[PDB]
Design a protein around this nucleic acid. Structure first.
Lengths: 46, 94, 271
RNA sequence: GCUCGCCGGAAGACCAAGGGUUCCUGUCCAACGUUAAUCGGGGCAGGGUGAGUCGACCCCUAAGGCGAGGCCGAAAGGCGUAGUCGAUGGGAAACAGGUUAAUAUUCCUGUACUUGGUGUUACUGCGAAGGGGGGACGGAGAAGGCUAUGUUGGCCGGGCGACGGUUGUCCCGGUUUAAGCGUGUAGGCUGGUUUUCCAGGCAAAUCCGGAAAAUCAAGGCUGAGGCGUGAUGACGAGGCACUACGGUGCUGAAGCAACAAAUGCCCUGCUUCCAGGAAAAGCCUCUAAGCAUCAGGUAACAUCAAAUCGUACCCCAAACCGACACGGUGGUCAGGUAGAGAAUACCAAGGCGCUUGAGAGAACUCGGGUGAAGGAACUAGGCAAAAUGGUGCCGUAACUUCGGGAGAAGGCACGCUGAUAUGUAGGUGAGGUCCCUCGCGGAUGGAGCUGAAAUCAGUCGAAGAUACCAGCUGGCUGCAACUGUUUAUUAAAAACACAGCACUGUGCAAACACGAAAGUGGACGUAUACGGUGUGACGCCUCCCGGUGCCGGAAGGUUAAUU
RNA sequence: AGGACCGAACCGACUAAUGAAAAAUUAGCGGAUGACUUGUGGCUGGGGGUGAAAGGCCAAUCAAACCGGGAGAUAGCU
């Protein structure tokens, strides 16, 4: 059965990657939030 | 034209292994560890100057570092650049 | 000619083809071509703005000349061509100075026919001259509404317009709709009817044919649930409401012209 | 190690994606492995991924994204021009053999190619953000020419049979060879060459386009395959020396022909249809500003250059997505016998026996086999089973929209051997002989090879479409015309859609829709069009305006802000 | 020629019996040149999308997704 997650690196990066997050305001805020929390992996970026 | 200092900083070490020994004995090819940033021409220049020996050609590759586990803690070894340097016929290296 | 296809399969039974042999069997004039990608009836917001559009065959865009400005040079018709972009047929013409253009193929036009634009041009089919030069009572097509803009009225397969009157700076046209409309007398127009008049006689004959023409199927509002359409819901078949659009506006009669800027030019509305 | 069994259009081989060391070697067996474990995709250590020509990067663009100015917007921001990104598409170049425990079109051996510089001598119009050409394009169908590949014969090597026979019309194996360079064929497309002029190609153009005029019928482009060379080479069945039983070193015959033949190539071709079928660069070409006897261009020759990143391994799976060593997952390769076949059966190459076993042979459950007599009596219901099942030929009703119905129904033949005919009809096609504008040519010729289908005669069986495979059929009737779609995971239908019909709106800055707007779709469309609503092939058809809607009217009544 | 026929791949999911499986199995079943199917990338966003329309689908979630916040909502109820 085709399960929901069907990985694709490029698609992952474009969707969720660092630059994408940077591009828009809301993404930047998300980034800031994650920094505040102390996340080790700020983004999906490997 | 490569700067001498850069040349000196290129070459990290000789690589000892069965495959390396075979390459040395048969194909007249030395296997070096080199700076990850070191390009082929650079490596060649450094070989020529620092070991005083003619180079035919350099093949390079990047060795990825192994993931290991010290006790409970996971940790990755460094990646590093390997260079097969083929030396001109009759070139004997110390 | 129209051709009723033999019923060797359902979906072929009711088919009627409109076959013109005189069209060009060949690749169109490539210089006048250009790309034309499909919308899916979706705008820049990415939302569907006009339902029932989608798919269909890849089509190129022939660059038709509706402005028709090569005044004084006589042109000769090379061939008639299939345009996927319109109900009419197009004609590749060759001007004496070496330029080629696509034009709407009028009714009587065929290969070898000579045509001409300009004030001096002759009053014969396919020729184009300002409507102050065109005699009253003539049929014209590809009519400009604004001078210099390009023909906008009467471009569809078998349309034409009647010049009923010329009163000073304006002339009054009888549009195919039956609407009587004033238009500046200096605007341009092409003599005769537009060509492919038996276009209407074709019948698709199956669902797939509609799809080929980029038309997605239509769901009736009454078949929906109330949350979707004003007509939705009802156990069994219920329709106890006045007909309306998906957006609640009355459909069977309610007028929707709101343009007060051009009211003056409409002599008489259609009926 | 020897037997047995399974897959073999896969359960084999190679990739992409995704994973990220799982690869190889040594070592260990606590945990992990549904048992044991000396084994492991487990632990620990070490090793392993070599590129000018493969891919990325790079040049070019699609959908789309971002977007200087700009337009719009309380703010945030939205749209969008110039631009710039964006492959899943376009754009230069490599093949064969050998080698590692583990990489290889990357190492080695041989033989190649590419496109840049730089320098040269030789020549002499070069030059783009611009013009033109090209790239550049659909579906289906039909062949013909080919090859991949396979079969047989020939040849070469080996063999003479654990049991009757087996020196022959016997048995086993092998019989392979690239890119490149030369040749330019089967075939496809197109008339060429020169001269003159011209409101066209945002300017110019010697280019394209268009007009004339002259002259010759061959000119050019394209093109699989074959042939030659590449190759006195490599590889080569197996023989022979050493042996850490893993292998290593030497050596090495023949290496031809015919037939058959793709879904691969010629073919981005041809024929045809309507639903009318990317873009841009690379590439060719034309000039402009320019420069002017310099640069630049093309000409060979020399030299330098090709960086960087990926390259292990899995990849229909125990390594990816599924919590698991648990169904899903795109591409490429496609042997033999039978067969229409990529179905099916048995096999090859190759890969596996699915990580608990041993007994026993109760009930009951699951999955199968057979069954006296009956044959739907079962049951809500013939559910399920059973049955039918192929090719050829004969034959086939109502009704019909004249196409259908129809494989209607129902029947007959079917194996093997011999003869017709030591293998026919056909297909292919060598020598020889003749012609020739000479070649991959044309005629004639028929050797050899291959080879159905039929008829007649015989013959065995209970049975010859013998296994696997492979329609059940007919009669009346509701609904829906039909092919389609649908509740992912209890509903596939009479529901939706449909072609068709009707009403209605909409004159283009269209109606309408998304948008505080700008704008965008509608549509680069224009009433033979587009939108909305209902109905729903086809046939015969299809009173009430009082109510509520809509349309038109505006005499009077009433009536806001305002005053 | 064909939204033509029989039929593998491929797409589906009518009947049947039966956790390896949070929808599968085997045996049969429908389509199989098209209103087909499929890879890669792109766009549409929550009273919003998309919808051959079933209130279907929008990450095992849908008559209004998920995450965080108002928030210790309110609970004459248990």
């Amino acid at each position: 059965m085709k399960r929901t997650f069907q990985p694709s690196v490029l698609k992952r990066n474009r969707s969720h990657g660092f630059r994408a997050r940077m591009a828009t305001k809301n993404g930047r805020q998300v980034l800031a939030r994650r920094r505040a929390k102390g996340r080790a992996r700020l983004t999906v970026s490997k | 034209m490569i700067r001498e200092e850069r040349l000196l900083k290129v070459l990290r070490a000789p690589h000892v292994s069965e495959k390396a020994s075979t390459a040395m004995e048969k194909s007249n090819t030395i296997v070096l560890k080199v700076a990850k940033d070191a390009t082929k021409a650079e490596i060649k220049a450094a070989v020529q100057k620092l070991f005083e020996v003619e180079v035919e050609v350099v093949n390079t590759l990047v060795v990825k570092g192994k993931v290991k586990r010290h006790g409970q803690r996971i940790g990755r070894r460094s990646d590093w650049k390997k260079a097969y340097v083929t030396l001109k016929e009759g070139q004997n290296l110390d | 000619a129209v051709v009723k296809c033999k019923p060797t399969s359902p979906g072929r039974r009711h088919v009627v083809k409109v076959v013109n042999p005189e069209l060009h069997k060949g690749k169109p004039f490539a210089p006048l071509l250009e790309k034309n990608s499909k919308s899916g009836g979706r705008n820049n917001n990415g939302r569907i703005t006009t339902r029932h559009i989608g798919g269909g065959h890849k089509q190129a865009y022939r660059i038709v000349d509706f402005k028709r400005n090569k005044d004084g040079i006589p042109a000769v018709v090379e061939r008639l061509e299939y345009d996927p972009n319109r109900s009419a047929n197009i004609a590749l013409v060759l001007y004496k100075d070496g330029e080629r253009r696509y034009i709407l193929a009028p009714k009587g036009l065929k290969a070898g026919d000579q045509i001409q634009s300009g004030v001096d041009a002759a009053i014969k089919p396919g020729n184009t001259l300002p409507m102050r030069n065109i005699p009253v009572g003539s049929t014209v097509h590809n009519v400009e509404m604004k001078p210099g803009k390009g023909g906008q009225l009467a471009r569809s397969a078998g349309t034409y317009v009647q010049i009923v009157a010329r009163d000073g700076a304006y002339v009054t046209l009888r549009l195919r709709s039956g609407e009587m409309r004033k238009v500046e007398a200096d605007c341009r127009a092409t003599l005769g009817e537009v060509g492919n008049a038996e276009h209407m006689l074709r019948v698709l004959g199956k669902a797939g044919a509609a799809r080929w023409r980029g038309v997605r199927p239509t769901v009736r509002g009454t078949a929906m649930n109330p949350v979707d359409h004003p007509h939705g819901g009802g156990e069994g078949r219920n329709f106890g409401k006045h007909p309306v659009t998906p957006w609640g506006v009355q459909t069977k009669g309610k007028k929707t012209r709101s343009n007060k800027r051009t009211d003056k030019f409409i002599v008489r509305r259609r009926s």
